[PDB]
């Protein structure tokens, strides 16, 4: 009962409702039938305050859905800089690989988020990591015409 409400509050970005549910004993690591947790949803949609609350209650920072995605994958994709920082400070695996073998650095470089690429590198992101189809973050940077990112990755190897 509680787990389902928490996922919904976290998805909708309702910080106050999330705090109540946690106080009322909700499973911080609740998961739907496809393995998605409240921290996944908060991280994906940029809800900083919900991410911090969930982590405080012991949310699994490195939980992975069926597609192998962690909260860090999703935040790095969406361009949520502060959440990415929080996740890493709270022990997020910087080089976790989704089912296509994308690392957070792959997704940030692809989607064009320069500042996130720099945070990921700062926390030891593997610049030479290859996804399932052999692509490096640099490869993804050039594919999508993000030259500034391609440059920073170049000088990081």
């Amino acid at each position: 009962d509680l787990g389902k409400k928490l996922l919904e509050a976290a998805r909708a970005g309702q910080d106050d409702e999330v705090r109540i549910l946690m106080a009322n004993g909700a499973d911080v690591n609740a998961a739907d039938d496809v393995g998605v947790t409240p921290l996944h949803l908060a991280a994906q949609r940029g809800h900083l305050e919900i991410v911090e609350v969930l982590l405080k209650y012991g949310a699994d920072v490195n939980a992975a859905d069926l597609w192998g995605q962690t909260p860090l994958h999703l935040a790095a994709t969406a361009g949520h800089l502060e959440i990415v920082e929080v996740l890493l400070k709270n022990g997020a695996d910087v080089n976790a690989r989704d089912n296509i073998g994308h690392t957070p650095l792959h997704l940030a470089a692809w989607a064009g988020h320069l500042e996130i690429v720099e945070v990921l590198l700062k926390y030891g992101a593997d610049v030479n990591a290859q996804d399932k189809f052999g692509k490096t973050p640099f490869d993804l940077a050039i594919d999508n015409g993000n030259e500034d990112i391609a440059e920073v990755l170049q000088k990081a190897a």
Partner: protein, 225 residues
């Protein structure tokens, strides 16, 4: 304006009624798409038991409106411009030295959900071949999906070849012929020649006992400057 419907995360449902060399079957799919990242996160289950064909062979048939069209290419996004009324997608698929699939589908919004309803008919397959024999490895390659305008039908013609890995190291080609036409009578964006670049990853839900396929896929448009 049809593109405006894809600014965020959209839920997706897929329904397929399949017939291959007499063996009838159905597959149901659930998940989400987000065209901002050309991304699909879906799960498929065979709702009639053991799937008579390998999962990889049904991928192309099981929502190109979720492809990422970059800014300088949005003029050329037929799939989104046909929304929300939708479009008909028709294919013939020829498996080299083997049988063929033919499919008709409608892709459209039913509510706030984009739905893909499919009929598939397969004929002329070898029972000991790579398909019915299940000799295809459980994965997927990356492909180039070539799109052309078709002013005659006010739609598009699309062509490509799927490469299916065989367990003995050889490859099985599947030749795809497809056309798309609007369901509504509104206008639609007819594109200059271009292609989609596709990536997919097949996987297994550890807590799933039914014959199933977990699908993560990324698609981006390209070939225009």
């Amino acid at each position: 304006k049809g593109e405006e419907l894809f600014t965020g995360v959209v839920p997706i449902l897929v329904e397929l009624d399949g017939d291959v060399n007499g063996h009838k079957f159905s597959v149901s799919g659930e998940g989400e798409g987000d065209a901002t990242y050309g991304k699909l996160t879906l799960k498929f289950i065979c709702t009639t038991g053991k799937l008579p064909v390998p999962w990889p062979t049904l991928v192309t048939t099981l929502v190109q409106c979720f492809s990422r069209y970059p800014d300088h290419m949005k003029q050329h996004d037929f799939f989104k411009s046909a929304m929300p009324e939708g479009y008909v997608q028709e294919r013939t698929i020829f498996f080299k030295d083997d049988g063929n699939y033919k499919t008709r589908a409608e892709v459209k919004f039913e509510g706030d959900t984009l739905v893909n309803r499919i009929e598939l008919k397969g004929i002329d397959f070898k029972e000991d071949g790579n398909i019915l024999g299940h000799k295809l490895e459980y994965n997927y390659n990356s492909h180039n999906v070539y799109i052309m305008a078709d002013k005659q039908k006010n739609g598009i013609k699309v062509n490509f070849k799927i490469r299916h890995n065989i367990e003995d190291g050889s490859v099985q080609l599947a030749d795809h012929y497809q056309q798309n036409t609007p369901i509504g009578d509104g206008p639609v964006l007819l594109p200059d020649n271009h292609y989609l670049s596709t990536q997919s990853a097949l996987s297994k839900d550890p807590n799933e006992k039914r014959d199933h396929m977990v699908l993560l896929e990324f698609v981006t448009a390209a070939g225009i400057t």
